[PDB]
Design a binder for these strands. Sequence first.
DNA 1: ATCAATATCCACCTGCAGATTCTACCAAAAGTGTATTTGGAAACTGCTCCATCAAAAGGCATGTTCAGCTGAATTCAGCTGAACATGCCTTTTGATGGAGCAGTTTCCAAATACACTTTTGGTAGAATCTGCAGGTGGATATTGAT
DNA 2: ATCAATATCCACCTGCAGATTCTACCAAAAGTGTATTTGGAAACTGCTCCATCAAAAGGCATGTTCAGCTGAATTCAGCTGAACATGCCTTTTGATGGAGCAGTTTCCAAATACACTTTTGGTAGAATCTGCAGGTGGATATTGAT
Lengths: 107, 105, 78, 85, 96, 98, 92, 93
Amino acid sequence: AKAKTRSSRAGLQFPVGRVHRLLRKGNYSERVGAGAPVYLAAVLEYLTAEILEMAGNAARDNKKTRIIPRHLQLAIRNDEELNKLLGRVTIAQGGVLPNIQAVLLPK
Amino acid sequence: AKTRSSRAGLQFPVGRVHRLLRKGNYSERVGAGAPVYLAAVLEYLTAEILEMAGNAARDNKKTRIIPRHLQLAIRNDEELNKLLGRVTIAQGGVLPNIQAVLLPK
Amino acid sequence: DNIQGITKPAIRRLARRGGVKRISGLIYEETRGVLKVFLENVIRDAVTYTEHAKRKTVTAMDVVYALKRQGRTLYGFG
Amino acid sequence: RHRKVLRDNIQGITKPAIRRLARRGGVKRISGLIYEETRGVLKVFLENVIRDAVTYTEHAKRKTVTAMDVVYALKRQGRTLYGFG
Amino acid sequence: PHRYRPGTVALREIRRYQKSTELLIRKLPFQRLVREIAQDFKTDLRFQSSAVMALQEACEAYLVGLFEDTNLCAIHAKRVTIMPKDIQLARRIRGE
Amino acid sequence: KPHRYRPGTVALREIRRYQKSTELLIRKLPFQRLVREIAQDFKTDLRFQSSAVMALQEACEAYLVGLFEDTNLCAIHAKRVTIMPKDIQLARRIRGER
Amino acid sequence: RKESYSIYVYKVLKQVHPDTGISSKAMGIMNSFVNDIFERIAGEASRLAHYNKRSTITSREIQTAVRLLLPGEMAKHAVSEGTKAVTKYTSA
Amino acid sequence: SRKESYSIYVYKVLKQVHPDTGISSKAMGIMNSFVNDIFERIAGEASRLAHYNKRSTITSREIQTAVRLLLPGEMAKHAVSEGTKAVTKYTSA
DNA sequence: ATCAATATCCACCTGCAGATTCTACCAAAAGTGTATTTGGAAACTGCTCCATCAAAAGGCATGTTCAGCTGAATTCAGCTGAACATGCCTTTTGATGGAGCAGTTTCCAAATACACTTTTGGTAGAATCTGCAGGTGGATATTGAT
DNA sequence: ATCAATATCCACCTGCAGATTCTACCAAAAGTGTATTTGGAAACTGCTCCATCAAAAGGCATGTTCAGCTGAATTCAGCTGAACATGCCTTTTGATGGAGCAGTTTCCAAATACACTTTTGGTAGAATCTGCAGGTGGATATTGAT
Ligand SMILES: [Cl-]
Ligand SMILES: [Cl-]
Ligand SMILES: [Cl-]
Ligand SMILES: [Cl-]
Ligand SMILES: [Mn+2]
Ligand SMILES: [Mn+2]
Ligand SMILES: [Mn+2]
Ligand SMILES: [Mn+2]
Ligand SMILES: [Mn+2]
Ligand SMILES: [Mn+2]
Ligand SMILES: [Mn+2]
Ligand SMILES: [Mn+2]
């Protein structure tokens, strides 16, 4: 009886089984379907991939090997849809975007 | 027989609140006193808003509370206005309020 | 064309209820713009609920859920 | 051992710190009355958050405010904080 | 012939419409607009009457609140006339 | 005549400096004393997880920076470059804080 | 068979204003208000019990949720009414 | 004393998208916060969806609808594509 | 239009604090088998909603006149930014000691489960009576000579 | 400012259509009685982590001087937006008729749940690996006097 993981069967990195247990015990519904954990894990993995891509690119712009919170803030705020999705979120140690109102510049 | 709402000295339905707690996917279990407590709180808030809205209806020569009276009761009460600060009362209108700088001198 | 059905007198009545005494001539078109955006954002979500229920009729409850999900809870239609 | 009673600590939010905060917010010039005003709003904000955090702490029958209590208090106030869970 | 001064009738309209609660946009154009916008998201939709009514109550309440904030922005800059910049400032501060 | 920058140059330079960095701008210990004093006014003999104070400080500074951005927009709206309490009041009223 | 709070709201109205009525639309707004507050309190109590690894919502979770959700004086009155109802229920 | 997090999966995705990039402790904490937040948003909307339609089961359909409600447009289409692909590969394989 | 003064930015470099990899145990996920729930399709029904037509009322589009508001221009006193000396208190790292959080076991009050009875809340039509057109008269506010 | 003329708004009133309240039936929800299980609190510890303070070095807060430039105050006209009269067309109101969608019941395959057993991926802690902070030095861009 050979063991394969659901994350392998869905071609995913995120843990399908853990997401299933977390749905099954979070008092979300009486029952949970077989494909809901796969779908949710895939969506979470995709969003993680997008933010990691843009933050790593920001880290490479700064000649840095490790992503730090500042790179995540730069990736989030400079992307329209990411900034929309996290419009009420605070990134600790992220700072803000460089932005000076034109009327404040010397005349 | 006797109903739980009668035994709690309440008008709001204790049994219905318990069923709605058990069926809303809130927790695996619901305690005996949680529906009583929740029904009491809901009845209290209803009593507050109905009292103030009836006073508004009687100021308006009216026998029946209408949405306008509920809007007036809510917005003229600071804590009700806080609790319903992002709530829209359909057909409620707004409070009469003209900025002083717009009034004639 | 159809967005122009929101006539200048109606936008003026809306501003009056909001306490406005004097209105610039460009405001009307600006208002139409924002109204369209608002309506779009609400209707999209409403339609999504309608599609999830395998219905072809937008119900008042769909609109109520769309409004609550956007932080603008509406009373009186449930 | 016990600390001396804490008093008037809102004055620890010094004018230079408020200036740095405004600078990060893009402010070039600050009226002299802003600082006390800022302290006022800050205290209100802090009060509300701590009030909710302590409430969670009291519900867990704990005597230690945890980072999770603060995170839950911020989330319930619409100010989700990342990085402390 | 009698002629009120500019601003008097505006104030009278402010009082009248802040005193009443009826909807201020004509129903038929709003209904056509709602159906057109919905068409761009999904085709061949029907609409509950209460759904259109609720959409209009929400839209008018939103616009009235936005006009209050816009008026405050116009007054902030020491004038009494709301301009597109007032609406834009109000929407930017609201989070829109 | 010793060197003297004109009013605004150093302010703009500080804007650039602090908009590029992410360190906390309020001193750690005074903020901790303020937090503990307020909590003491809510419930006595409370202890604090070390990360709880840091979370409170990150949240407070982010909130104040955002409020100062909105205050700057309110000051500029009225054709001036100096933020006043009236700007903060307008921004807070529009945000829903009032 | 559609469910609402209408009869209970009307009974409370007759308590506070014996000779005052209510319009259909105002009653609908009443029902919306009751459902909204119910959902707020129940959701906060759910999250409270979950944060503390409790599978049971009790009067304690409801009390804490009411303290979190309502403004101060209103919260104190609502807590008083909930406690009073629970004590009369226990003794009844 | 055994705490679970998403850290290893996030790191595997990071090595996918940037083989030569690392991540700091605090940034990992932020990423875990992000994953948990999005999980809660999607699961709560799916719960409410199933309850609105008197269904006792959260299925792939509720998750899809919640994703369409929660994400901005193009990001929503992308996430729907990846979720659908994952479910279809899961069923047949 | 330069030139001195100052700040910003770039490239280098190394040690260690922080990040990553390694390791092995075990909780949790997977496999299996059985029990329980449910989705959905097939046939059926009755409201809703949309299509369509028609009259007519009132609200809107338009043009005209002008009052007054907004924007520009100007001027000035004082406030706020720049720079510096001075000294304190914050930061960093660690010690000490105990408070309180977390792991574990035991067992009862409280919750769930189930079969059956009693009560109740929803609904539609009848009965009741309030709120609304559409009028008047009086109070109040506005506007123009003076 | 008073005084007359004019327009608007509010409070009243009647007649009655329509909305609300009252009434009675019944399917479904709550209540009841009894049996059984179980979550979590109470007690007991074992350590993690927090409170508080200590030293010392330097970063930063504070007060002061002074002057540049900003906010505030003011003036004035042009041209924008308000107010109003007029005519028409869009919306509103009313009626009729079907199709089409929203619900509804039932039954069987399919999907999901759950207990038991087996396996392994995930974790904590130890060991290993490394980028980047924190220094120096030089080039370069900016700023302000002149
Ligand atoms: Cl403008
Ligand atoms: Cl001010
Ligand atoms: Cl309980
Ligand atoms: Cl599924
Ligand atoms: Mn105190
Ligand atoms: Mn102890
Ligand atoms: Mn009955
Ligand atoms: Mn009338
Ligand atoms: Mn147990
Ligand atoms: Mn100026
Ligand atoms: Mn292994
Ligand atoms: Mn460096």
